[PDB]
Design a protein around this ligand. Structure first.
Ligand SMILES: CC(C)CCC[C@@H](C)CCC[C@@H](C)CCC[C@@H](C)CCOC[C@@H](CO)OCC[C@H](C)CCC[C@H](C)CCC[C@H](C)CCCC(C)C
Ligand SMILES: CC(C)CCC[C@@H](C)CCC[C@@H](C)CCC[C@@H](C)CCOC[C@@H](CO)OCC[C@H](C)CCC[C@H](C)CCC[C@H](C)CCCC(C)C
Ligand SMILES: CC(C)CCC[C@@H](C)CCC[C@@H](C)CCC[C@@H](C)CCOC[C@@H](CO)OCC[C@H](C)CCC[C@H](C)CCC[C@H](C)CCCC(C)C
Ligand SMILES: CC(C)CCC[C@@H](C)CCC[C@@H](C)CCC[C@@H](C)CCOC[C@@H](CO)OCC[C@H](C)CCC[C@H](C)CCC[C@H](C)CCCC(C)C
Ligand SMILES: CC(C)CCC[C@@H](C)CCC[C@@H](C)CCC[C@@H](C)CCOC[C@@H](CO)OCC[C@H](C)CCC[C@H](C)CCC[C@H](C)CCCC(C)C
Ligand SMILES: CC(C)CCC[C@@H](C)CCC[C@@H](C)CCC[C@@H](C)CCOC[C@@H](CO)OCC[C@H](C)CCC[C@H](C)CCC[C@H](C)CCCC(C)C
Ligand SMILES: *C/C=C(C)/C=C/C=C(C)/C=C/C1=C(C)CCCC1(C)C
Ligand SMILES: *C/C=C(C)/C=C/C=C(C)/C=C/C1=C(C)CCCC1(C)C
Ligand SMILES: *C/C=C(C)/C=C/C=C(C)/C=C/C1=C(C)CCCC1(C)C
Ligand SMILES: CCCCCCCCCCCCCCC
Ligand SMILES: CCCCCCCCCCCCCCC
Ligand SMILES: CCCCCCCCCCCCCCC
Ligand SMILES: CCCCCCCCCCCCCCC
Ligand SMILES: CCCCCCCCCCCCCCC
Ligand SMILES: CCCCCCCCCCCCCCC
Ligand SMILES: CCCCCCCCCCCCCC
Ligand SMILES: CCCCCCCCCCCCCC
Ligand SMILES: CCCCCCCCCCCCC
Ligand SMILES: CCCCCCCCCCCCC
Ligand SMILES: CCCCCCCCCCCCC
Ligand SMILES: CCCCCCCCCCC
Ligand SMILES: CCCCCCCCCCC
Ligand SMILES: CCCCCCCCCCC
Ligand SMILES: CCCCCCCCCC
Ligand SMILES: CCCCCCCCCC
Ligand SMILES: CCCCCCCCCC
Ligand SMILES: CCCCCCCCC
Ligand SMILES: CCCCCCCCC
Ligand SMILES: CCCCCCCCC
Ligand SMILES: CCCCCCCC
Ligand SMILES: CCCCCCCC
Ligand SMILES: CCCCCCCC
Ligand SMILES: CCCCCCCC
Ligand SMILES: CCCCCCCC
Ligand SMILES: CCCCCCCC
Ligand SMILES: CCCCCCCC
Lengths: 231, 231, 231
């Protein structure tokens, strides 16, 4: 484990995702509202999945070597197995908050799968220049997601209860800022141009992951928007 | 790329799926009917997924070598990753058109997963004679799907609006004819008996894919069956 | 095939899953109740999936070698591909029986995916002591599932029709007893401590699989709880 300088950030990430999972699990014990139960189930699964994948990276299972640039490059593939399941769950939290229609939910989840799937292909591609073709396709899929979150959901939240509109607006802004950083870290990190070393890259993804999952969840599950209007 | 004679058909397929995706995306911009939005989302995702997998084959990522018959045989595995997601989406288009019940939808999607999954196992199997055992199981799963589309959905469409009944009947006939060709191309192509060479096999799958996805989508999204009855 | 002593139990399992699939398929022909159709579709898919994965193990495709303990250990990975899809389908049978809320269904299916996913990682892990870390995480996920089936569903079934309450109680008890045996067989078998040899381990999993899928299905599909109350 300790033979890799980035191990400290993988261990911290593992701990923070595990602690986040347990807090949400305990906090959700005393909840019977069927609407609130939906948000607790979605939001608790997110850091639980991330916990297992951070642990796999810490123990060395989620790491492979990819030859490109005449070098064997360490690629943590477990990140994409994490994101494949956690990013659509996070979008479902937002879509259920605004009572989005089914067709829009399917478009979001499908574009998200394309985003993560093409990012994985780009991470494992051995022809250096082709890695950035996949990065560009994946980034186009992300821009579609961000467009929908702004010019489809925002207008839908305003016609909703005030507390669900204000909570959505906050979580929307958090998501757009944090998610946009991921393609940048990829491009300048060891998967892309190799400007930033792997140990610093790992620290950046850990800060982003914890903020986008645990921080996101703390804002959502403390809001009254997750409960139905009741007397 | 150009070192493979089949590259021209992979490049054409990539272009036609990309163009198809963009047309459906633009055409769906001016749509607010929640029913129509469902069909546009399903139908636009189909060629978008196929685009990415054709590109992976063009660039050489979606290709592996499988030893059988005393030879290293080029097997494009990316086809099955495509079909795993696009064939159930196409069946969902048909099932939603006739307002099929949930139990029937699950049976269709499950049989479809078995069809594609066993076809993938057959494509990667190293014992030559066993490849055709998997082909037979996969073909049995397809025949179940075709039976349901005829002796379960057809009777359901007649009790529906006339425009949804006539549109379903057309898309049903297109699907049964085109899908039935796939097991035949597999059997006589490089995955099976090896009668037809890979470059011709690739041309045939490209014609079938574009027809079953883009051609299918053009018929559906030009129909009024996708809109609810409104004044 | 016959070069492996466990082949006899893989062949028996294949036959019993295939026969089970055909019986459920025939029995479900004469069913039009939309509620009953749901249970028949879920319950017939379970042994059909298991059939294909037992066949892959029989023919040698679903087997790999994992080095640990200074030895190349035969690991049947196809079991986890089976369980990944069949265990959530079995939980869906139970959840639909008691009309569970959506949030609870998602929590069950998500915990089940974590259970199977971490068990697969543990089966393929090359550092011997780490294999049991994954076993423990997977077992914690199972205990969560069992808790929900007892202290969330049981109370919900009592407020239901008497026949659905008594049928659920029976299937609940069958599930908790049979599922609990799996982590024990893993721990003492070739994936874990290696006390029980592989051929005996394979026999035990076959008895458990057939009972948990075909036996489970025979109890459910003979009950009147799967039909709506009708005159
Ligand atoms: C009902 O809706 C509320 C349940 O949602 C919340 C239910 C959760 C979604 C269930 C998923 C958690 C499982 C219990 C998994 C247990 C293993 C975890 C990875 C444990 C990690 C923390 C600890 C080991 C440090
Ligand atoms: C509606 C939305 C959900 C739609 C989703 C969008 C999606 C279509 C976007 C594209 C996804 C696609 C790129 C997934 C590729 C997975 C692949 C990286 C797995 C590893 O295989 C890659 C190479 C080794 O580098 O295999 C070496 C050769 C091996 C012999 C490969 C044989 C196994 C194949 C991988 C079998 C295909 C399985 C499916 C891809 C499983 C789904 C994986 C997940 C990442 C989507
Ligand atoms: C709301 O419902 C309508 C949206 O459906 C339609 C929405 C679509 C389903 C969203 C999926 C498309 C994404 C925007 C993916 C973008 C990358 C594409 C693969 C681009 C391919 C064409 C071009 C690069 C040649
Ligand atoms: C309700 C419906 C959706 C049900 C679906 C029906 C489905 C059950 C039908 C059978 C599907 C099954 C054959 C999928 C097999 C995937 C497999 C080809 C992936 C590549 O692995 C094959 C060998 C190399 O040749 O791995 C070499 C050895 C490696 C060490 C393998 C270890 C990884 C395992 C593959 C882990 C299992 C992952 C799941 C199979 C992922 C789903 C893939 C998709 C193709 C279903
Ligand atoms: C409508 O709801 C009822 C259909 O459910 C029941 C429908 C089933 C869920 C459909 C799935 C079965 C498919 C027909 C697959 C056929 C291949 C099987 C694996 C055959 C195995 C048995 C035989 C080959 C020994
Ligand atoms: C809501 C719920 C459904 C959530 C589900 C819970 C889930 C997150 C729990 C953890 C699942 C995770 C451990 C799955 C790992 C699959 C992995 C074993 C496949 C084989 O790859 C392992 C190594 C060889 O030993 O690959 C060698 C290196 C290769 C180069 C690997 C590159 C391919 C990657 C495997 C791509 C990721 C694909 C996804 C993991 C596909 C889903 C598989 C299924 C088992 C979940
Ligand atoms: C909890 C994890 C989250 C919210 C991860 C989000 C990840 C992304 C938005 C990743 C995007 C990428 C691109 C847009 C292209 C480059 C490759 C990716 C996958 C890093
Ligand atoms: C857009 C792609 C489509 C509609 C693909 C359809 C593919 C099939 C219907 C494939 C069927 C197969 C068999 C029936 C057995 C032989 C292997 C397959 C997977 C080619
Ligand atoms: C039809 C198959 C069924 C119902 C299989 C159930 C399997 C389990 C409940 C497996 C549980 C495991 C653990 C709890 C940890 C050890 C590894 C597993 C996956 C065997
Ligand atoms: C979206 C965030 C990207 C900003 C990356 C900042 C990295 C600064 C760290 C110093 C770079 C290390 C280079 C010298 C080793
Ligand atoms: C009462 C609110 C705080 C509860 C404690 C939460 C502990 C989980 C770890 C959170 C750290 C990361 C927060 C986002 C920066
Ligand atoms: C379902 C369509 C299958 C028909 C295949 C027709 C192939 C004819 C092309 C000529 C065969 C090439 C053999 C000589 C190289
Ligand atoms: C107005 C209808 C035609 C629009 C142009 C569609 C261009 C997408 C490519 C379609 C070619 C394949 C059609 C099926 C044979
Ligand atoms: C949950 C069931 C686990 C019980 C396992 C009993 C196995 C007894 C078979 C004899 C053990 C073989 C050891 C000598 C070869
Ligand atoms: C009339 C009920 C029996 C029908 C025959 C079922 C045959 C399928 C194989 C069942 C054997 C396994 C039963 C569970 C132990
Ligand atoms: C490729 C993996 C995608 C599945 C991720 C799991 C979450 C799915 C959310 C589905 C939302 C409901 C759509 C109607
Ligand atoms: C194995 C991958 C299957 C999933 C394909 C994605 C489409 C799923 C459609 C689900 C239809 C809704 C069923 C109720
Ligand atoms: C185009 C939709 C408007 C909202 C999206 C904001 C774009 C942020 C740019 C992200 C940069 C990634 C490289
Ligand atoms: C048996 C259901 C009737 C409709 C299915 C038509 C069968 C077409 C044969 C396809 C040939 C594939 C080898
Ligand atoms: C803790 C929830 C109560 C019901 C679960 C029964 C636990 C059975 C123990 C299984 C042993 C697996 C190692
Ligand atoms: C080795 C660098 C080659 C540059 C390729 C950049 C491709 C980016 C595509 C974005 C449209
Ligand atoms: C090398 C050819 C061996 C023939 C096997 C055919 C199997 C087909 C099974 C269809 C029932
Ligand atoms: C080689 C045996 C090492 C023992 C590790 C046991 C780990 C079990 C963790 C359960 C909390
Ligand atoms: C609940 C605390 C979980 C912390 C265990 C993971 C941290 C790795 C320490 C080496
Ligand atoms: C929108 C046009 C997309 C065409 C790019 C793919 C074709 C491959 C050319 C080499
Ligand atoms: C319907 C009977 C299915 C039996 C075939 C599988 C058994 C393997 C025999 C070698
Ligand atoms: C993106 C930063 C999240 C901050 C988490 C703190 C929330 C406390 C209510
Ligand atoms: C299967 C052939 C499809 C033909 C596509 C043309 C549709 C234009 C309306
Ligand atoms: C767990 C044992 C199941 C027994 C199956 C027999 C059911 C006949 C109704
Ligand atoms: C109005 C809410 C502002 C939230 C933005 C937070 C950016 C990290
Ligand atoms: C909408 C604000 C985008 C912020 C992008 C930050 C990328 C590091
Ligand atoms: C490929 C772009 C299509 C141009 C608009 C078609 C008419 C909606
Ligand atoms: C009555 C519609 C006929 C459609 C059949 C088309 C076959 C390619
Ligand atoms: C229902 C007509 C079937 C046509 C099969 C064509 C196979 C090449
Ligand atoms: C009251 C029903 C008892 C069922 C338990 C069966 C254990 C195999
Ligand atoms: C609730 C009874 C548990 C039985 C466990 C059996 C494990 C072999």
């Amino acid at each position: 484990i300790t033979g890799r300088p980035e191990w400290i950030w993988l261990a911290l990430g593992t701990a923070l995702m595990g602690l986040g999972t347990l807090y949400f699990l305990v906090k959700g014990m005393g909840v019977s509202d069927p609407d609130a139960k939906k948000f607790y189930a979605i939001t608790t699964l997110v850091p639980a999945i991330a916990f297992t994948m951070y642990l796999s990276m810490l123990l060395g299972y989620g790491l492979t070597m990819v030859p490109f640039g005449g070098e064997q490059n360490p690629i943590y593939w477990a990140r994409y197995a994490d994101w494949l399941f956690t990013t659509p769950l996070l979008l479902l939290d937002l879509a259920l908050l605004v009572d989005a229609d089914q067709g829009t939910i399917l478009a979001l989840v499908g574009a998200d799968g394309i985003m993560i799937g093409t990012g994985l292909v780009g991470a494992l591609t051995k022809v250096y220049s082709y890695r950035f073709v996949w990065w560009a396709i994946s980034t186009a899929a992300m821009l579609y997601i961000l467009y929908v979150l702004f010019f489809g959901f925002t207008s839908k939240a305003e016609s909703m209860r005030p507390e669900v509109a204000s909570t959505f607006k906050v979580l929307r802004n958090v998501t757009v800022v944090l998610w946009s950083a991921y393609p940048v870290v990829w491009l300048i990190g060891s998967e892309g141009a190799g400007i930033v070393p792997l140990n610093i890259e790992t620290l950046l993804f850990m800060v982003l992951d914890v903020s986008a999952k645990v921080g996101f969840g703390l804002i959502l599950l403390r809001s009254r928007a997750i409960f139905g209007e009741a007397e």
